């Protein structure tokens, strides 16, 4: 039996060609050129 934090990136929360890196109980988005915001939502 194990405890797993889970992959919070499996829902693809990073938008607009952004890249998702899983973290602990969270994720970070690496945004492409021309996009910003926590989910790369902002032009
Ligand atoms: C999968 O996709 C949905 C929308 O399509 C996201 O909202 C889900 O992320 C949510 O659920 C898991 C939480 O870990 C996540 O919030 C944490 O990670 C991002 C940080 O910006 C935030 O401060 C932190 O609480 C939440 O956004 C995603 O799993
Ligand atoms: Ca995780
Ligand atoms: Ca889009």
Swiss-Prot record:
Disulfide bridge map: 9-20, 14-29, 31-40
Residues annotated to bind Ca(2+) 7: 5-6, 8, 22-23
Phosphoserine carried by residues: 26
Effect upon mutating residue 8 to P: In HEMB; severe; New London
Glycosylation sites: 11, 19
Effect upon mutating residue 14 to R: In HEMB; severe; Basel
Residues the record lists as (3R)-3-hydroxyaspartate modifications: 22
Domain EGF-like positions: 5-41
Highest taxon above the source species: Eukaryota
Effect of residue 31 to F: In HEMB; severe
The protein, known as: Coagulation factor IXa light chain
Gene: F9
């Amino acid at each position: 039996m194990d405890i797993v934090d889970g992959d919070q990136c499996e829902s693809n929360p990073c938008l607009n060609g952004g890249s998702c890196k899983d973290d602990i109980n969270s994720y970070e988005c690496w945004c492409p050129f021309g996009f910003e915001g926590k989910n790369c939502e902002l032009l």
